[model samples]
Target chain A: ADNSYKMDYPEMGLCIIINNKNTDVDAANLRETFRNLKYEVRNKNDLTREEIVELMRDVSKEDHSKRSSFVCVLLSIFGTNGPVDLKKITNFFRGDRCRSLTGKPKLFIIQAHKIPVEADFLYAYSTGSWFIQSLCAMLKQYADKLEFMHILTRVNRKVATEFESQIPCIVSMLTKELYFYH
Target chain B: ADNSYKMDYPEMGLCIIINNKNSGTDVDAANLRETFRNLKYEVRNKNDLTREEIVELMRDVSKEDHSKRSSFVCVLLSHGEEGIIFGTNGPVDLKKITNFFRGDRCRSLTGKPKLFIIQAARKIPVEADFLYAYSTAPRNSKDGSWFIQSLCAMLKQYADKLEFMHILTRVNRKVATEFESIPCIVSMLTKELYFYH
Candidate 1:
């Protein structure tokens, strides 16, 4: 009612995400699946630029909808041509400032060309790629919780080491964080 | 090259002001103008004689051309509470004043650096690709508000070498000893900004 995000993942206070990319079959598939699961699904295109920025700026402001476990799942299409700043999107969840999501495992899964920095920011990216196909394959096959880090490692290994070496930014930061993660 | 910023303003320097002078106001203005000028900024200093005039001044300063300057600064010296700042005559929402230069409103400075430095507050909310450096700390002064003194010292000492966050980080470290201070830098500056003078 107060627009803190209306859905029902009250235990973890889940906030599901959406974007204009529902036109894309894959994004639409994910959106329907999550909505049926009864998570709060927000449409990016439904909101103005300032509106989105304001939402994230105050993302942690509310009583977190009176839930102990607050999490957000994003499904935005990102690229060099994309209108969003991946870093700012990443910043919305950073605990350095945000209080409600602070000290929590507020996991993230972004879809884009590059996985920008920030821990727990899982990447299920690529508007189109064999990478998406493979990642989604794992999602279907493994019901073992949404361990995005595992999906990343499994995808990295499946993608071929040479390609891994080729992706300078995403793969580089990803591997470094993974190395530190382990 | 990408729209990381709309387009970078490669040359420029301007520091606009709306000082509401209290007892230690002299150090706040003088040290900043000197430091900015030392760092090659064409520095300026001004103030509020009355409330209406202060409000008028902010709108006028926000609209100034910054196309030629690499960066811009807004320094307001006053005491305030909650999230509002005091003009010589009244209270102004700090963010509203800063928002005047946000990307859409001040297109010339959209991608360039904009520093909105204000003083005395509950907490200042900083937004998007700008620097909100507060001189809110270093409570006792004449030697100066240690926040400004240490900040200028850092800029003068490290102007050529480090990026802004790095310099601001050093400022924090220095002021931590005298008192727990140093401006809180809420930064959305996506790239490395080096201001060498």
Candidate 2:
């Protein structure tokens, strides 16, 4: 149980791809990436902070016992104190806050050129907003074959090699190997 | 190449491991010192420095010549908050220390990689060519802190064979799975980095 995430359930989980469109990182591509991987994908654009928070709360409140994991792709930005508070968004699904997702992996693939963490949580943040392209490419080719962190490692190198002044940061609290196996 | 920091210098550069604890043994500092030393870095350990001393030391380190060196690393082992690391007397703003090494100020170290492995919990501003490894989230220590322990073990095992970021990712996994804490790695480095040439 400690070596790998449980992904055997009938449902793979939910994915919310929020594209505020402040900057484009291909939300459509992200939706396709997750949707094809067995996730129930939903898309949104130009959401106010209030709307985004409500969406997160609603998602966290849903029953996820039947799902294997959760995924979030945020491609835009701002929040309660001004810009969006990443920690706050992540708090909604912490082990204590969202019991149903206690041991499940929650992946937040953000391409807003910013962000931050929890156990079973993984944040893929891009500082120059170029992570989405590389990330989608890697996920498309390696999702079923590689562990999530290994895929991210390759993305880090790919972004570092191909883009100038850009690097992807991966902050993980996951306790096991995560593979988006088909 | 402009893509990655030059690591072929005769010297790998200096590593400053600051342990600001008031009591008990400082095994973490010793372990880090040896680890960096084995990696060909000239390691220095600063123990129990007051906030002002810590600031002065960073300024001095940044002022030195690093033209022949490939990179710089500083390890801070102390009590810290969101943006502050404690000195012997009181809290110190993490930025004040890190700012001295910014490319604008530290001309000699410009374009070189500057890595800060903070065992204490923190953030400085985002600047190019600098990488920060934080122990935990602001709202979040011992057996030398799970983050540092895992970091040392991983570096010992893979510092020469693996890329630095990849090594840190492995450390993050070790700590998160073996302990309750998870580290945060923030990088503004624009190129692939490796300890080995």
Candidate 3:
């Protein structure tokens, strides 16, 4: 459910890709959580940074053609320069590739975190290895029994922005706007 | 975080040692098995297997306890100067090992970061993760190489809280205290990891 409204598509289409390089946050549980909620998810783990960028575009091509409203979930490091890695994923749905999503709201559930190099930037404080783990847990506790938009706003509140980390976002197609709730 | 739910030490300690006889790699695997054994990890010290034998063993190992184990460690003690690790007989390309464990090939330990400690040389194994403290890292030691002693010491002292990288950081400091020259430690591991369990 989104903002007291239900999703239109029969089964919610979801793509979950996690760059499981060094961290171990028990991603199998995250996959299981959505599976129980009737979410059709293509979950991928331990992909390289480059592999992740490719998967986003390739998966979107098929997803846009198959499902009406789709969500792309990414669990990876958010670098220093804005969420470029994320923007790169969303850029796939521009006025070209995923154009079918035109005027179709696209929700992005990102557990984006920037673990500032301990030696380099010690002043900044962010979540440890709790990026995707927290997002999934929060979704289960809040969104599992509620509406999509409501849960979206609530999650966004707790994890919207802290420098370049925690940029869970929602893009409204009708207004051509990106909303950062927190 | 709890004494009740303490991280259980599994009977699953698998350490694969690749020794090059010509390079006197016997010096490299020195006490490594003992160190790992002490840490409750399985240890395999072999100079008998050729490239095929090594790969075959690794493939089976990757499959057998592939899921249950939280971590896997590989120690390569020296000079395959070329692209090969120079087995007991023939030469084996590092890619053969990497291809076996690539996320596509081995679904078992994809997210589970497998640690590798190679002799810092050309490029790394492209293994996607873990702390690599190249044993040939210019160590001046009487009993063992600085890489081995320092690493074992740090791991033994703080294996509870510090993960591989953090432990390496201390090893770097401790080793530096003895050797005036700094070991060209190159760690590009992307994630924060551990050997806690």
Candidate 4:
């Protein structure tokens, strides 16, 4: 027989990702990546933010470090066929607040295709982009310790390659920074 | 001012079409249709169903539809992408349910578009285009009561058209709005509001 236990926690952190795909090429690749990530998440215990944090804390302490060892990256894509609104991403992050607080920096990397073509385009673009910008700005001002980070990058030919590689770098930087700071 | 108030009743003859895209194509379709038939027969009053009872009834209903409805239809489309499904009891067929009420059945429905709203998430990656309207969303599984509210809203908006698509469009809008709030909370609060008038 095997022993299994459920871990419960009170508070959590939230992270949201919004990706926009302007090009057809990037869209296909992005879709594959999203599918892969979703599969991975589903296969796991589907741990909440607090559970994830507690697990990370155990891992970090076991490794004789004060900081946690796990890095959870939420990759969201936005663009023509990408997430049209930021509200969904925001709501998801808000709901998963536990994961954000477990000493792991929650990073939201938003890849969008910014084509300043028309006025309605402004409405479409501004609605999502501006909302995110304003949200991050407000969080930074008031809730500076909330550990929410957003990187909005323009889409281009090397979008997929760059997107894939940038993830590890950001995770490494954020994790190392958390170690150094806390 | 038109004084005819909107009346939406879940206990009435309501049709639900589920499409199960899983299992063998024809076999799965038949099984799923049978499942819906079973549910249609068994689920006389949803108010009286317990969670376990609902699941059990669903499973029993999945066995076969001994009784079938001539006026309404239900389809369950299941194929493991992103759609709603009964856990263990029954899997409804989404397509057969729609087809039963379409074309020829439309005349039976008195020109109603044969209400066929899918619970299955499309095989698309984009979230915007893919409307991920959950029954009760992440926290609550048994919160399908919101659908009833949306149905009421739809009946109010498109009472004249009587077109299934128009009604569903409004239902989609209402569902989207109601889903923004926590499940059951709105319905609970609105109960008193309904009594006020």
Top model by DockQ, which number?
Answer: 2
Report the C-alpha lDDT of model 2 over A4-65, residue by residue, as the tens digit. 78898889999998877544447777877888898999988778788888899989999999
Q: What tens-digit string does per-residue lDDT give for candidate 2 at B95-141?
A: 78889998789997887889998876444465667787877532113
TM-score of each: 0.50, 0.76, 0.44, 0.24
Cα lDDT computed for each candidate against the true fold: 0.52, 0.77, 0.50, 0.27
Strongest candidate by lDDT: 2
DockQ score for model 2, please? 0.28
Off by over 4 Å in 4: A1-182, B1-82, B87-90, B93-112, B117-136, B139-144, B178-197
Model 1 misses residue B127 by how many Å? 4.4
* Rank ordering of all candidates by lDDT, starting from the highest: 2, 1, 3, 4
lDDT at A74, model 1: 46
| DockQ, all candidates in order | 0.04, 0.28, 0.02, 0.02
Interface root-mean-square deviation of model 3 in angstroms is 18.9
| CA-based DockQ, model 1 | 0.04
Classified by CAPRI criteria, candidate 4 counts as incorrect
Interface RMSD of each: 15.1, 4.6, 18.9, 22.8
Which whole-number lDDT from 0 to 100 does residue A100 have in model 2? Answer: 89
True contacts kept of each: 0.00, 0.31, 0.00, 0.00
Model 1, residue B83: distance off in Å is: 3.7
Q: How good is the docking of model 1, by CAPRI class? A: incorrect
For DockQ, candidate 1 versus 2, the one ahead is 2
Weakest 10 consecutive residues of candidate 1 chain A by summed lDDT: A168-177
State how far residue B101 of model 4 sits from its true place (Å).
Answer: 6.5
True contacts kept of 1: 0.00
